[PDB]
Amino acid sequence: SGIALSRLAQERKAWRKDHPFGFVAVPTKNPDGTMNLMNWECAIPGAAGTPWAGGLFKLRMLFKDDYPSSPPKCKFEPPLFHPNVYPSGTVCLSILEEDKDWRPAITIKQILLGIQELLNEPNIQDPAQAEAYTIYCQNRVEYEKRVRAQAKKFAP
Numbered sequence: 422s423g424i425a426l427s428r429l430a431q432e433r434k435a436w437r438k439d440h441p442f443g444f445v446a447v448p449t450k451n452p453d454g455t456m457n458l459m460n461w462e463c464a465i466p467g468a469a470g471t472p473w474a475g476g477l478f479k480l481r482m483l484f485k486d487d488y489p490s491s492p493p494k495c496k497f498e499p500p501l502f503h504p505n506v507y508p509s510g511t512v513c514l515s516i517l518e519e520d521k522d523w524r525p526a527i528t529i530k531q532i533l534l535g536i537q538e539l540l541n542e543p544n545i546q547d548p549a550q551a552e553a554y555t556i557y558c559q560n561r562v563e564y565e566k567r568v569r570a571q572a573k574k575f576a577p
């Protein structure tokens with residue numbers, strides 16, 4: 422898709438000039454070794470001073486041929502403990518749904534900062550996984566304990 426590929430080249434240029442420290446976003450390769458702009462491997466650092474601190478959380482960003490009409494699918498690989506991340510790893514966030522708050526102008530940097538913000542501030546209104554949501558509601562201390570253990574597990 423020429424439209425998607427043109428926009429994704431624009432995103433790649435912008436990202437290299439200006440990206441938040443400690444974040445990673447890199448296109449993958451096709452089986453012939455050429456660049457695949459439709460599939461990016463990314464990493465989000467936990468914010469300092471939070472239970473997420475010290476972790477580097479890997480996620481894949483998958484673009485459909487009609488991007489930027491549609492948002493990319495964002496999937497933590499491996500899946501994470503968080504009330505708004507599905508057991509599959511897929512992130513549940515309003516800016517990542519075409520019918521909700523997605524706008525074609527939204528950039529990869531804005532998506533990744535949006536997901537980082539979500540990590541430290543769950544949305545109790547759209548629970549995506551039972552366990553993390555239930556613990557968040559029932560025992561915030563236990564929740565943060567689980568988050569810190571996870572951050573340690575994913576230290577780079």
Ligand SMILES: CCOC(=O)CCc1ccc(-c2ccccc2O)c(O)c1
Nearest residue numbers: 445447461462463464479480481482498
């Ligand atoms: C992407 C090149 O590797 C680095 O920049 C180190 C940080 C990193 C960033 C992303 C990934 C990753 C993310 C999603 C899916 C598979 C991966 O390997 C990973 O394994 C490692």
